[PDB]
Design a protein around this nucleic acid. Structure first.
Ligand SMILES: Nc1ncnc2c1ncn2[C@@H]1O[C@H](COP(=O)(O)OP(=O)(O)O)[C@@H](O)[C@H]1O
Ligand SMILES: [Mg+2]
Lengths: 16, 1476
RNA sequence: UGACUGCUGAUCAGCAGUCACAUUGCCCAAGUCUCUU
RNA sequence: GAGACUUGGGCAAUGUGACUGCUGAUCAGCAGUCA
């Protein structure tokens, strides 16, 4: 792959 | 400070519950349960002040870790008035004794420490369970199974059930692990193990709401996508690590210890080879988990740790391994950072560019973590942040700490707000990112967090319990939750309001985390329901179930005296004992276990043993348990190991290794039993051998009361009684010349003087005496002429003549001297004699009746001189005169007269142009006027010498002044003449120099007779009545003014017919201390006495104890030959008062025999020693007693006594108030001070003189006389002959030709040793180093070297005494110490190539010997004699020392031992005997 | 349909072994500093 | 000799995770035999 997949610029701190 | 610490309601309820009965408190963390424990401790203060023996109890407080213990100790110290103790294993409690233990327990009302230490100190009966009031434990959830908390709780049942102390536990989480299913069984287990119910708050309206100020956090979970593919760099690095690991096993190093799995079933790898594998396997995990940047950071840590290990590598092989590891690590780092630097240029914001590339080169988990960090703190004030980070691996803490540092520095906003820090468990990681020891740190990370110096705190699973930290408002977890207890603790860290609890999970593993977190929550809810809704049960003190929970273990063995050994503590106890075995560095301090297969199980043990396992223990060879201990047939291998260790420990205690309290004993405890066995005589002096304070006065000297020999005590002749007189002859021993006739002719005159005693005298030796003009030898008549005093007046006149001799004719007199009339010590007499009828010699009666008082040389003027009768030459021939007109002091012997010379005649010399008459008138005629006779005879005269101690041997011709002195010629009528016979004066000038030597030859002969009679050899024709004394010997060795030659002492040892009589002079030599400065000294026998005493003590200890280790035997042996012990065992024998130490100057340091102090003065002196010690020579010299009282009355006048007492009392406050005078006035009162060193020296001198003549065997009887080696009365002959023929036991009853396997090619050893062993057990036992597990049929070398040292030392000392007869003893001791040096032994061992055949398994010492032998070969087996090699290996000299004793014990022939010792010492002995 | 075997999978419990990780403790001994022979 | 801290080694203890071996139970199916 030679690189890391850039994760989404945004994500949710979901409440359990 | 307690008023502001006012308790809350729930705390009161909890304390009230825990006081009534034992229980386990359960509240969420931060509720103040430790404060509850403080109050509980306060509730038992009713008996904390009373001492233990009076019924006082001490509080006990114990915690699982040292940090929690320290924090709670500080808290209780500040919050209580009790003196808080501290009892931990990190403060050095290992080597405590009962003293400080008892005083610490007495002084500290509350005790704090770890678990194992408290277990040890309660098992060893320092304090009983009945001696405590309340015991408080914390974090009880660790205390299950075999944890020390459970073991401590077990002791409550085994002890007195009544009056049992209260116990309560502290915990916030009650169950540890993922087995939380069916919480009821674990709740019951914890409530029964600690014999107490679990309690919790039960009404949310008033308790839970109030305590919930420790508010629960808010759960937050962030998901990240999985890793879709792996990179090229990771797999390339792993491929390199593959061949790295391959070469690691390919890399061959020295022998290493053997490690196997915990069940002893699989073969493991050495720890030093597996640490690198563990490090690289953690690095690979870091790479695969946290990203390539994390690996770039962590390879630096690998560099750091590998560099530290390479610096600290003991052996070159370890250094090579760590160097290869460092090279591979550096290659990995370069290859990894190449990729980073190939893309750290994507944009022009330099440091923000670094931030962006870190974001790019980070795994989705760490990427999400970084985004959470950025968006969480909102770039607020740095003091507004309180966050914690938990990761599993220890190295992950430092890795993510470095990543956070770099990223924060790379952030524009977070740079000014965030500062990271990392800590790990107690196995701390090197915090530096560069070379070791950057700086001396002084502030702990926990202290940084508490002080507010940091807001982020990276940590492993070390930060859940114990550490007191402020309530964080953020918690982040980077790795999935593993255990329920860790979850509860980590979520309990976030205690303040609005706290953030964040945990990270992967996408497709999100649901598993969801289910596990709800199971944890449901388990907590079920625990709460169980506690709240349970039946109203009591404390549950059900003994049946309590016992039913415990019996599964082996029954705890308690011995007598109340001590107890826990089977679960058996491994620790046994290993602690085994480490105490003496070693080099390692010495195999671990017991080698071995499990047995089923065939052995049903071969040895019962029919039941097919399934149950059996394990065998092999104790190290340096332990007397040479056999093996078999384990009980047990269910599983772990309990089988426990049983084996427990039984081995019980056997070891049965053999006395473990003490009364199950702790292994050391030299301090070993010598305690032997104290009253060999050192009982110290008790009569009060002190003891174990009393180290008794050595505080080692260097000081001691005083003694001297006494004359029995031949002199009460030897005064009495009127009308049989009295014997001994004629003294002073034979010249030189060629007479013109400078010697004046004394040569007079001394050989038939007239002489005799010493007269009522008692009889034994035959005495011939003395050497050195006059300044010739050599003199003096003899005493064997047959004493006997006369009986028929007239008391004759005896009186003899007595005043004897007094006048010392008073005037030698001027050996003081004004305080008084004629000793009484018959007492030294009260003999000196009598002049003249020829009688035929060979018979009688009294020179006219001589004594004429010279009662010395004539006075009156100065006569010519007016007076002209009316006295004219001089007539025969009246002056052979007389003594004095040149009064020139100097009224000099005596002057008239050797001849010049009847052909007149005063008118010309002077012979120095005024040859002029005459005697006018010469006298020139200088002396002014005061004397004219002279009567101008034409009469002249007299040529010679002067007497003024020397007084004729012991020194220097000689020479005084040609500068003798020619002028021998020509001295005087006028007859001018110089006053005493008309005294010059021969008699010329003989008595030497008299004190003879009397002093006889006064000690009598002692020597009387001691020799006693020693011979005790040995029962006095009946032999060479001794007893038929003994012929021999003349003394001059010591020219001193400077102070083919086949080996058989050794004489050993030659006479085997053959009793080679004995020779003991000489009186040889005893006198050992009597005369070197301080007295005689022609011969005692130091020559002292070294052999020391050698023989050490040899005999060593052999006696070896025969007495063949089981104890060499260390205690060596220290006891050194204690036996200690000079203080020799002092204490020689004082009883009454030897010191017989010695010769002081100088002999009669004018100032010697007391005349027949003259002493006044009787009343002596009575006063000896009545009050305190009053006597403050009297100096001047005080005695103050008076000048008249003739009557001093001579005839033999006392002092009453007014004279008054002047003595008044002067002494005045001097009590005079300038000399408090000064010491005993250093010079003791010689007049028969007292002397002798160094204890001299006492030990003379003890050894007597032993040496006995040994060198009577053989080794007889001297052992003399050691019995000195009660050193107490005789075993059952078998006394073992102290006589078996001392050199003993030392072995039944160990030789087992044998096989298998020994040749251990002795690989020992034929070369025989060839290069010369000796041919009859038994090979001795050689094998000598060659086995204690670090050797391969062999068990034999023993170690220690208990052979113990004897070999003594044997080699004794033979070397005997040889140097015999052959080296021309060199000083002061250098002889140095030569002996050089011949016994360990480096010389190592050189001898390696020269003959004895290093090959040593049996040892220890890599470091093996490499030491390897680096030694090559250097020695480079020296060509010729050590400069010491060579500055790396380090001498003690073992090389040790094995030679052991082989010496093995060779001796093989044949018991000391001659063979001397032969082999000489064969191995020939070149070194020849070199050293030439130069020390 | 029952009895029973053979095959095989799944769930669950228990024991034992291997490998790795985490925390806690004792012991021996070394280094330097200070007290100090 | 002692106190502070660091270095170094050995053993014991708690818990999780992974793989294997074995026993017991439960569920299910197939194939084969009898009733
Ligand atoms: N009733 C109280 N009175 C005064 N201070 C209290 C009280 N309860 C708790 N505290 C304080 O709160 C802190 C709680 O810390 P700690 O005792 O470690 O909690 P826990 O033992 O529940 O983990 C203590 O330092 C204590 O000083
Ligand atoms: Mg706390």
């Amino acid at each position: 792959i030679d690189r890391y997949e850039q994760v989404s610029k945004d994500f949710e701190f979901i409440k359990i | 400070e307690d008023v502001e610490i006012k308790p809350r309601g729930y705390q009161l309820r909890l304390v009230d519950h825990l006081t009534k009965s034992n229980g386990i408190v359960y509240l969420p963390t931060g509720s103040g349960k430790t404060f509850v424990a403080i109050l509980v401790l306060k509730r038992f203060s009713q008996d904390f002040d009373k001492p233990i023996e009076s019924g006082g109890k001490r509080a006990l407080f114990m915690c699982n870790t040292v940090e929690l213990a320290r924090q709670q100790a500080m808290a209780v110290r500040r919050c209580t008035n009790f003196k808080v103790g501290f009892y931990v294993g990190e403060q050095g409690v290992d080597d405590w004794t009962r003293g400080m233990w008892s005083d610490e327990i007495k002084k500290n009302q509350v005790l704090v420490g770890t678990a194992q230490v408290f277990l040890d100190m309660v098992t060893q009966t320092y304090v009983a369970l009945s001696s405590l009031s309340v015991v408080i434990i914390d974090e009880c959830h660790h205390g299950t199974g075999h944890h020390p908390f459970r073991e401590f709780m077990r002791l409550f049942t085994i002890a007195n059930q009544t009056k049992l102390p209260r116990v309560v536990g502290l915990t916030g989480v009650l169950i540890k692990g993922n087995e939380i299913t069916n919480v009821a069984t674990k709740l019951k287990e914890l409530e029964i193990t600690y014999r107490g119910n679990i309690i919790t708050v039960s009404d949310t309206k008033e308790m839970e709401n109030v305590m919930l100020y420790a508010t629960k956090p808010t759960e937050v979970m962030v998901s990240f996508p999985h890793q879709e593919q792996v990179l090229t760099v990771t797999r390339l690095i792993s491929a390199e690590i593959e061949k790295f690991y391959v070469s690691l096993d390919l890399m061959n190093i020295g022998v290493q210890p053997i490690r196997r799995s915990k069940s002893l079933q699989c073969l493991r790898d050495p720890s030093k080879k597996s640490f690198v594998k563990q490090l690289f396997n953690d690095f690979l995990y870091q790479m695969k988990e946290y990203g390539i940047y994390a690996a770039s950071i962590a390879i630096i840590s690998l560099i750091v740790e590998f560099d530290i290990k390479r610096r600290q590598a003991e052996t070159l092989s370890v250094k090579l391994m760590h160097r290869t590891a460092l090279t591979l690590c550096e290659k990995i780092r370069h290859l990894l950072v190449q990729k980073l630097q190939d893309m750290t240029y994507d944009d022009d914001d330099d440091n923000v560019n670094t931030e962006e590339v870190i974001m790019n080169f980070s795994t989705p988990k760490v990427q999400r973590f970084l985004m959470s960090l950025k968006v969480s703190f909102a770039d607020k004030d740095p003091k507004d942040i309180c966050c914690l980070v938990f990761v599993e691996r220890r190295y992950t803490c430092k890795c993510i700490y470095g990543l956070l540092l770099n990223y924060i520095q790379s952030t524009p906003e977070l740079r000014n707000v965030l500062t990271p820090q990392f800590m790990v468990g107690r196995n701390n990681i090197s915090p530096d990112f560069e070379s070791v020891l950057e700086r001396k740190w002084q502030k702990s990370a926990i202290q940084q967090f508490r002080d507010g110096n940091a807001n982020l705190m990276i940590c492993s699973s070390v930060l859940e319990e114990g550490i007191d930290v402020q309530a964080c408002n953020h918690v982040f977890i980077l790795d999935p939750v593993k255990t329920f207890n860790m979850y509860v603790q980590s979520k309990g860290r976030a205690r303040t309001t609005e706290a953030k609890f964040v945990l990270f999970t992967a996408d497709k593993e999100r649901e598993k985390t969801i289910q596990q977190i709800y199971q944890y929550r449901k388990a907590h809810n079920d625990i709460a329901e169980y506690l709240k809704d349970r039946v109203l049960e009591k404390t549950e003190p059900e003994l049946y179930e309590i016992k039913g929970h415990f019996q599964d273990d082996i029954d705890p063995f308690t011995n007598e005296n109340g001590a107890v050994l826990l089977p679960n503590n058996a491994l620790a106890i046994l290993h602690r004992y085994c480490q105490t075995i003496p070693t080099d560095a390692f010495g195999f301090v671990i017991p080698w276990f071995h499990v047995l297969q089923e065939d052995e199980r049903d071969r040895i043990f019962g029919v039941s043993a097919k399934g149950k396992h059996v394990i065998s223990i092999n104790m190290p060879v340096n332990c007397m348990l040479r056999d093996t201990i078999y384990s009980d047939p047990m269910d599983n291998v772990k309990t089988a190991k426990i049983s084996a260790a427990f039984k081995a420990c019980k056997v070891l205690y049965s053999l006395g290794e473990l003490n009364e309290r199950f702790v292994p004993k050391t030299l301090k405890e070993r010598v305690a039993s032997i104290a009253d066995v060999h050192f009982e005589h110290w008790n009569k002096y009060g002190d003891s051998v174990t009393a180290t304070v008794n050595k505080a006065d080692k260097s000081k000297d001691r005083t003694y009361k001297t006494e004359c020999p029995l031949e002199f005590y009460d030897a005064l002749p009495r009127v009308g009684e049989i009295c014997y007189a001994y004629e003294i002859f002073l034979e010249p021993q030189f060629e007479s010349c013109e400078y010697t006739e004046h004394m040569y002719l007079n001394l050989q005159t038939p007239r002489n003087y005799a010493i007269l005693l009522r008692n009889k005298l034994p035959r005495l030796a011939e003395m050497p005496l050195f006059s300044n003009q010739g050599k003199l030898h003096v003899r005493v008549a064997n047959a004493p002429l006997e006369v009986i005093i028929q007239n008391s007046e004759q005896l009186e006149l003899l007595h005043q003549f004897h007094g006048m001799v010392f008073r005037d004719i030698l001027k050996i007199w003081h004004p305080f001297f008084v004629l000793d009339r009484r018959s007492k010590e030294n009260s003999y007499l000196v009598v002049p004699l003249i020829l009688g009828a035929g060979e018979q010699k009688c009294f020179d009666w006219e001589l004594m009746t004429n010279f009662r008082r010395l004539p006075q040389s009156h100065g006569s003027n010519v007016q007076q001189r002209e009316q006295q009768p004219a001089p007539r030459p025969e009246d002056f021939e052979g007389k003594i005169v004095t040149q009064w007109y020139a100097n009224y002091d000099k005596p002057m012997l008239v050797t001849k007269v010049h009847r052909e010379l007149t005063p008118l005649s010309y002077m012979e010399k120095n005024q040859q142009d002029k005459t005697y008459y006018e010469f006298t008138m020139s200088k002396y005629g002014n005061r004397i006027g004219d002279v009567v006779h101008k034409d009469k005879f002249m007299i040529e005269v010679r002067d007497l010498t003024e020397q007084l101690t004729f012991y020194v041997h220097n000689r020479g011709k005084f040609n500068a002044k003798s020619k002028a002195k021998m020509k001295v010629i005087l006028i007859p009528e001018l110089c006053f003449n005493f008309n005294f016979p010059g021969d008699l004066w010329l003989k008595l000038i030497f008299l004190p120099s003879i009397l002093n030597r006889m006064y000690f030859l009598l002692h020597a002969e009387a001691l020799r007779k006693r020693f011979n009679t005790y040995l029962n050899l006095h009946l032999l024709p060479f001794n007893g009545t038929d003994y012929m004394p021999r003349p003394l010997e001059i010591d020219y060795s001193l400077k102070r003014n083919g086949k080996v030659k058989p050794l004489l002492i050993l030659q006479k040892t085997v053959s009793k017919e080679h004995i020779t009589p003991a000489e009186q002079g040889e005893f006198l030599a050992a009597i005369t201390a070197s301080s007295a400065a005689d022609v011969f000294d005692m130091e020559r026998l002292e070294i052999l006495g020391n050698s023989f005493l050490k040899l005999s003590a060593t052999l006696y200890l070896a025969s007495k104890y063949s089981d104890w280790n060499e260390g205690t035997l060596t220290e006891v042996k050194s204690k036996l030959v200690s000079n203080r012990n020799l002092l204490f065992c020689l004082i009883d024998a009454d030897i010191p008062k017989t010695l010769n130490t002081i100088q002999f100057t009669p004018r100032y340091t010697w007391l005349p025999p027949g003259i002493s102090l006044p009787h009343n003065v002596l009575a006063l002196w000896r009545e009050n020693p305190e009053f006597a010690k403050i009297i100096g020579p001047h005080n005695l010299r103050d008076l000048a007693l008249g003739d009557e009282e001093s001579l005839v009355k033999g006392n002092c006048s009453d007014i004279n006594y008054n002047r003595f007492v008044e002067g002494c009392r005045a001097n009590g406050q005079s300038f000399y108030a408090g000064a010491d005078f005993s250093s010079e006035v003791n010689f007049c009162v028969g007292l002397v001070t002798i160094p204890n060193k001299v006492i030990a020296d003379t003890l050894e001198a007597l032993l040496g003189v006995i040994v060198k003549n009577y053989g080794l065997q007889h001297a052992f009887k003399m050691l019995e006389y000195f009660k050193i080696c107490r005789a075993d009365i059952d078998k006394p002959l073992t102290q006589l002959l078996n001392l050199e023929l003993g030392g072995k036991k039944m160990r030789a009853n087992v044998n096989t030709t298998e020994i040749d396997g251990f002795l690989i090619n020992h034929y070369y050893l025989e060839k290069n040793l010369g000796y041919t062993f009859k038994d090979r057990r001795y050689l094998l036992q000598a060659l086995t180093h204690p670090s050797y597990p391969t062999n068990r049929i034999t023993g170690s070398y220690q208990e052979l070297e113990f004897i070999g040292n003594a044997i080699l030392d004794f033979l070397i000392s005997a040889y140097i005494f015999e052959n080296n007869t021309k060199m000083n003893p002061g250098a002889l001791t140095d030569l002996r110490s050089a011949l016994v040096n360990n480096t010389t032994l190592a050189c001898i061992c390696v020269r003959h190539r004895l290093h090959f055949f040593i049996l040892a398994e220890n890599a470091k010492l093996s490499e030491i010997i390897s680096k030694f032998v090559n250097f020695q070969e480079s020296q060509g087996h010729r050590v400069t004699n010491m060579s500055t090699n790396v380090d001498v290996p003690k073992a090389l000299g040790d094995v030679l020392e052991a082989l010496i004793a093995a060779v001796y014990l093989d044949c018991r022939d000391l001659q063979r031992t001397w032969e082999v010792i000489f064969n191995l010492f020939e070149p070194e002995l020849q070199e050293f005997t030439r130069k020390v």
